Amino acid sequence: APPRLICDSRVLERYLLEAKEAEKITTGCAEHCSLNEKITVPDTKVNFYAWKRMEVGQQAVEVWQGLALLSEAVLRGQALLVKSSQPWEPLQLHVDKAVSGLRSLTTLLRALGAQKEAISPPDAASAAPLRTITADTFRKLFRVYSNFLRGKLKLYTGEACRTGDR
Template sequence: MVYRTGHFALLLIILEWIRPGLPSPLRPICDLRVLNHFVEEARDAEAAMRFCKEECSIAVPLTVPLSRVDFDVWEKKNTEEQAQEVQTGLWLLNTAMSSFGASITNSALHSHIDASVRNIASLKQVLRSLSIQDYVPTVGGTGETWTVSSASELFQVHINFLRGKVHLLLANAPVCQQNNR
């Protein structure tokens, strides 16, 4: 089931890119239903991890982005600063998921982690479609972070980050605002 839904989201993104018969550049993906799909998959993964005890323990705490949004601070940032914060958060989540995935042997749980890593890559493609450049943080430039020590916490941060900062960035992307006028 995880593979089917993950492939569906990826298929939507690819079809949006190739648009048969149209030689136009990558069209912006402004439909928040794509993001909602990623949130649902993260919820499924978090639910699966909740019942996993010893096998899902994290030996070394993982660094993740702070998912809490201070709306006053967020709104004072320009789009580029917001995008860098989201890109940095996605990079941190990807790194944490990959590290955690390397320690898991259960194939069912591993499939949730793989799906989450693929979804993060797909989200980066969505951001590119909105003309948001890739950003990889430099050493010490990862912004506000905290650490998690359980798989459930990792996926809860993932969900909250998607529902918070990623949602705000996508909902207010300038290219999407122009399309709504």
């Protein structure tokens, strides 16, 4: 059969591989990847404990708040340096790749078509939670994009698979 739903390590693993390459430059530049903004960033500190208080359906709604956050943070991230000056090599190139990943993610979660019942108003977190910390540097977004998926992605994937190899 195919590489399962999101239990396809090749896909998620690939997120880590990418954020890896991405991080190198946000931790190697000299001016870019470190502006003076103030964008919040999701807290990957979540755990199986506080995560369990979200049944399969709700669980999916939770990961959905996480990518929605990043959608905005990453959007401005592209914009500010595009519209403003921000010298140094074209950093935005990477902000397009990382962008496609969160996007495929959004469509992916909707792709298993399984328990998700992700139906809610236009909002989903972009108007209440935002219990995230501010960011005055890109080093955060990319590092976060490394830790973030290891958080909720692992959890969602656990449920995506919910069989392993029994």
